[PDB]
Design a protein around this ligand. Structure first.
Ligand SMILES: OC[C@H]1O[C@H](OC[C@H]2O[C@@H](O)[C@H](O)[C@@H](O)[C@@H]2O)[C@H](O)[C@@H](O)[C@@H]1O
Ligand SMILES: OC[C@H]1O[C@H](OC[C@H]2O[C@@H](O)[C@H](O)[C@@H](O)[C@@H]2O)[C@H](O)[C@@H](O)[C@@H]1O
Length: 596
């Protein structure tokens, strides 16, 4: 029988955004501003919005998002917050957020709330929201300009040790949130933190890790559950600990830039310790995939520039990758650039993967961090499970010259007992019941499938090696007997202040008590326990926390199945199993099953 338990110690922001599914669908001005190297004129912003309203908003791309080139946004409120995107604009943020509302859309904003504009500093009448004693001028160290060393002289970096700083930062984050912004894209924090860039040299004065982590905590608290926090230049120190604790999205690649295959799949394949750890998103998504999933981070592959690619097969591959990784789907094509490529973004079955909350992982091959061993995960084969137990499976051929067969076996790789019905989502074709998904792919081509296991008597298996991992839980395959490619270890007592855990998203037809099974190993020499909960996306408890018991077994190569019962509500539940301070021993976890 199960006993009551205290809650697990978390190390992630664990917001409704990361719990509820994949990244958002949006449009960004980068397609105009990057090639023009200039801020988007207000009229071009308007024409793009109107085009989105008529052509893509109906496919869920209902955020229009500003980007950089913000040095020329100098007008501020009485408390130093920018009133518009650029000083050339006739209308303020409120006007645009409502013009967007009139078209069933929302405003996305690119800004860093640690920027303090020079013009605000130079107007001594401006003061910190709620702190009339602190002039905006009192928030900065003279000379401490963003990008100082490369000519920057319009934006200061905030000195977070100055009185009024917290109120300034938090007021800036709520300023946008209150305006109706569901998405804040925060860039340049690595330049803030250590004043350097591996692709340039010194850029400005360093501010240090402690200040960086404090600033993030302020942003997190200020954004709350209402506004999604995208971190665009994360240094990802300590396996991304500060970013995981305080953000929803992290960029995992160098900028889209001129786009095309080389940005998507080239440049360099190796890891480096500096922003960006990996240059291309195939490597970046694969490399940071251990940090993805419900309640952890959403990985951000940046912007899709469809007409920068060389073929329609490349365009499909671009989209398939973002979808497979659970990334935001961010269109950067303007109304002038889209040409005949709208179809890339609006395949309903492919979009349905993102809607249902697909967050795939590359096929794990070993426990070694991908940063140390590129053989440890397969950048070209991806799979993830939807809450209802169906799957998204994606296969890629990154060869420039050879046609290559890729396969995911449902028993050997995914760890299922049942096979599944397979639908090719670009062919829009049912392939029937099968034991694998496979494609002979031309160079740069891909395939993506919905795989739907049959459910004899409702039984649904969720393999742990494709679930979400936190607090030191991770993949291994170093004791035989597991179903699939491996299992989850690190569910043991540890140094850190976070508890190791695995989270599964599960979808059930009705409220009730459900039979749950746990395939595990435990050769600690004694019974082990784990804390199990069910929760709503908003974190509300549906069941537990309770200690579940796992009988000791002869060896680590021995597997067994513990039985339990769990109360789940209709629809989406997050079932999280982990090792708290009060739990005993350790387990390795292969899968859970629910009879629904
Ligand atoms: O005004 C800020 C900044 O805008 C432009 O850069 C925007 C890009 O910055 C990268 O760091 C980021 O990864 C990309 O997603 C952004 O689009 C501009 O080029 C730069 O000079 C400005 O300072
Ligand atoms: O604690 C459960 C754990 O037990 C066994 O591993 C013991 C330790 O092995 C070390 O090499 C490793 O670095 C430590 O983290 C382990 O605690 C077992 O082999 C492993 O599979 C189990 O998870």
């Amino acid at each position: 029988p199960v006993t009551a338990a205290p809650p697990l110690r978390l190390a992630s922001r664990n917001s409704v955004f990361t719990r509820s599914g994949a990244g958002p669908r949006y449009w960004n001005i980068y397609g105009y501003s990057f090639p023009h190297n200039a801020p988007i004129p207000e009229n071009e912003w308007k024409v793009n919005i109107d085009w989105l309203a008529g052509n893509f908003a109906d496919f869920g791309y209902d955020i229009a998002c500003t980007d950089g080139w913000i040095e020329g946004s100098s007008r501020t409120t009485g408390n130093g917050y920018i009133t518009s995107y650029n000083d050339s604009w006739q209308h303020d943020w409120a006007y645009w957020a409502n013009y967007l509302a009139a078209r069933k859309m929302k405003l996305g904003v690119y800004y860093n709330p640690l920027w303090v504009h020079r013009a605000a500093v130079e107007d001594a009448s401006k003061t910190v929201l709620g702190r009339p004693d602190v002039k905006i001028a009192d928030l900065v160290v003279p000379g401490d300009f963003f990008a100082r060393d490369i000519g920057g002289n319009q934006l200061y970096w905030l000195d977070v040790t100055k009185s009024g700083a917290k109120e300034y930062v938090q007021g800036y984050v709520r300023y946008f949130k209150d305006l109706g912004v569901p998405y804040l894209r925060i860039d340049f924090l690595s330049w803030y933190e250590d004043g350097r860039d591996a692709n340039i040299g010194q850029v400005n004065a360093p501010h240090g890790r402690a200040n960086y982590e404090l600033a993030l905590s302020w942003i997190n608290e200020a954004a709350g559950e209402d506004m999604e926090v995208s971190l665009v230049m994360p240094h990802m120190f300590q396996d991304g600990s500060a970013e995981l604790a305080n953000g929803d999205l992290v960029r995992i690649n160098a900028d889209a830039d001129k786009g095309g295959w080389d940005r998507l799949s080239g440049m360099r394949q190796n890891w480096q310790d500096a922003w960006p750890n990996w240059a291309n998103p195939f490597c970046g998504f694969t490399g940071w995939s251990h940090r993805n999933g419900r309640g952890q981070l959403i990985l951000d592959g940046d912007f899709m520039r469809a007409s920068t690619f060389a073929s329609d097969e490349e365009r499909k591959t671009m989209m398939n990758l973002m979808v497979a990784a659970g990334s935001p789907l961010a269109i950067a094509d303007t109304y002038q650039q889209i040409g005949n490529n709208a179809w890339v973004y609006t395949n309903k079955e492919v979009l349905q993967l993102n809607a249902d909350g697909l967050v795939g992982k590359p096929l794990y091959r070993s426990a070694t961090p991908f940063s140390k061993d590129p053989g440890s995960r397969d950048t070209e084969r991806w799979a993830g499970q939807l809450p209802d137990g169906s799957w998204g499976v994606a296969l890629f051929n990154r060869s420039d010259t050879e046609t290559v067969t890729k396969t995911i076996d449902f028993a050997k790789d995914l760890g299922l007992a049942t096979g599944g019905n397979v639908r090719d989502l670009w062919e829009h074709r049912n392939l029937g019941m099968d034991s694998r998904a496979t494609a002979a792919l031309a160079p740069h081509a891909s395939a993506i499938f919905r795989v739907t296991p049959p459910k004899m008597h409702g039984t649904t298996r969720y393999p742990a090696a494709f679930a979400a991992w936190g607090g030191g839980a991770g993949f291994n395959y170093n004791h035989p007997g597991y179903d699939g490619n491996g299992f989850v270890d690190g569910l043991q007592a540890g140094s850190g202040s976070a508890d190791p855990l695995v989270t599964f998203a599960v979808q059930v037809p009705h409220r009730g008590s459900y039979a749950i099974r746990y395939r595990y190993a435990n050769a600690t020499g004694d019974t082990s326990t784990m804390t199990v909960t069910a929760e709503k996306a908003d974190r509300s408890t549906v069941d537990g926390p309770v200690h579940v018991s796992f009988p000791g077994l002869a060896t680590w190569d021995t597997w067994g199945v513990a039985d339990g019962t769990i109360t789940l509500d209709a629809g989406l539940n997050l079932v999280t199993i982990g090792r708290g301070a009060t739990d005993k021993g350790a387990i390795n976890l292969n899968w859970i099953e629910l009879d629904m």
